[PDB]
């Protein structure tokens, strides 16, 4: 089965007070990690039920989940919504048992068994990673004069349109170039919000050999993480059954570990 969840964050009120939940959302590595401890090891939940031990990546089960973050829900209060889709049952009472100030409402979970027929009108919302891998020459220095070096870089850059086409048309072309393999066809697709996402990540680096030996002394060094994001909403029609279900809970684009593929489907 498929499991969907919702988390609510205030993100508002008095700006003069500490707001740890508001601070948690500025980094996407932290958001992904915080969703990632929501699944302990059969042994871990018997070892520390209080979640008061050092966190290591190896004592938690591995599952390729997908998530998206949304905003602007009114009702005289501001809210931030995290929607998590996974193939195992999340344990929301273990991830946030010492972090209740993050959220303005207790978490909720429900089952999801979506069964469809071919040729069905469906409403979808998706934020896509607009990236293309390209060949780039190497520019260095730029100390008032550009120095060229013959190395050609294979790097992942954003998709680029020309000067005479709208971004929505090029994004729709990029999505309809891919929709035959996933199992769907477009009729309409408009661009809502396009932008960048920054993240920072700890990475260990060696410094000095221990005098007593057995390892190093080490120091954390932090590496940037830049991605392109474009949020899209539209109406699609199904072309294959086990193929649309092959599209769901697997992803459509790249960077899925950092919340870049999630299909939210409504039968219109």
């Amino acid at each position: 089965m498929i499991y969907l969840s919702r988390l609510l964050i205030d993100t508002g009120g008095n700006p003069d007070r500490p707001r740890p939940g508001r601070k948690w959302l500025d980094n996407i590595y932290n958001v992904h990690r915080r969703l990632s401890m929501a699944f302990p090891s059969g042994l871990r939940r018997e070892q520390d039920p209080h979640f008061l031990k050092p966190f290591s990546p190896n004592d938690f089960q591995k599952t390729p989940f997908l998530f998206r973050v949304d905003n602007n829900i009114d009702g005289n209060d501001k809210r931030a919504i995290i929607i998590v889709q996974s193939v195992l049952e999340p344990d929301w009472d273990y991830c946030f048992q010492n972090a209740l100030d993050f959220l303005a409402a207790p978490p909720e979970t429900k089952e999801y068994n979506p069964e469809f027929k071919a040729g069905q009108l469906l409403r979808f919302r998706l934020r896509v990673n607009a990236s293309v891998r390209r060949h780039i020459p190497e520019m260095v220095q730029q100390d008032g004069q550009t120095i060229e070096t013959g190395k050609i870089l294979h790097k992942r850059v954003s998709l680029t349109w020309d000067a005479s086409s709208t971004p929505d048309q090029a994004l729709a072309d990029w999505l309809a170039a891919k929709s035959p393999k996933l199992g769907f066809t477009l009729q309409r697709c408009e661009l809502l919000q396009l932008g960048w996402v920054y993240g920072s990540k700890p990475e260990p680096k060696n410094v000095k050999v221990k005098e007593q030996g057995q390892g190093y002394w080490r120091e954390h060094k932090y590496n940037p993480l830049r991605f392109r994001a474009a949020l899209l909403e539209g109406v699609l029609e199904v072309d294959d059954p086990k193929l649309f279900l092959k599209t769901l809970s697997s992803g459509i684009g790249k960077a899925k570990s950092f919340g870049f593929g999630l299909l939210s489907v409504l039968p219109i």
Partner: protein, 367 residues
Amino acid sequence: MLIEIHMIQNHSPANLNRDDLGAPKTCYFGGVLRSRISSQCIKRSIRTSNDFKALLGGVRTRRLADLIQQEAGETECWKKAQEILNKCGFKNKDDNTKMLVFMSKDKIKDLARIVLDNSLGLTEAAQQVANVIAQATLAPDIALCGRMLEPNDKDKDKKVKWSNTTVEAALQVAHAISTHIARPEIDYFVAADDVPGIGESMFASACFYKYFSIDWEQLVKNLKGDTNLAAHTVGAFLLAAAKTNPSGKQNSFAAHNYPDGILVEFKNSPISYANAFVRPVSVVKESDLVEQSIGQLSNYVNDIRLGYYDEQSPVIGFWFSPNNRYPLGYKHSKLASRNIGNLNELVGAVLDYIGGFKWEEVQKSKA
């Protein structure tokens, strides 16, 4: 005899007054957080306005030698005037001129004659300056405030004696406050360079009530008579308070808003209606915030007027609304003696009740 003044003004979202935080001023009243506008900012805005310009004759300076040098002409007189001001005792300690003087003295030429007199010693011209500075008392902005000078005794000579330095101001200005609870918002910005190759700003919104009270007898006595100047200053300050806003970030936070309701009362005592907003106003769907606020003030005014009634001191009150948009006595009470639809005839009737003065002839009293 005291005239009380009541501004009922709704503001658009802006940031009109801030502390060093960039956040708006705030206060606690009735136990909850509210918006705040300081009274010195309101007085400073009204003083530097087009309406209150003919009576703008008083000057608040920290650098007195500059205008002496300008008034004297093409001569060189900065150093001698500065040494005279030094030995007068104007706090030469700690490298600053931090003491502030609130003279009117728009006839600077007298001090320029004293400093340019090549006949007296450096001690005597100091006393002549000390004698001319303490006698202006004119320019009715100092008939509304004025505590011109406290001379330091440490840095002054032993051969100077100072005169009285109190004008006994007549105007009491309450701190402007809101009728509800203030809610702060952060606006993010970015420079975002033109050539190829996030900050935080605060604001909030509130609807305000204001209270101004003027003692007519003290206002007349502070100008040494001339009831025409007192009348002109009353009319000019009422016209100024009806249309004046602080110039705080108005280039990007433009909040050119007028009061919705204007109230005057006549009684020999000062009474504020600040308790009318002890309970902060929560909005219903069938009405707006401003109507709820004026209804609260109307109920409070009926309750106080039925609370302290004395047969020896009648109270006369005028009510003004924009084309009679906001009535005061909505349900049954005729609390106001008369309702006026225009601002000019309101101030004219105020002058008529004061002493029968008409706005045409009293405007000739520039001073």
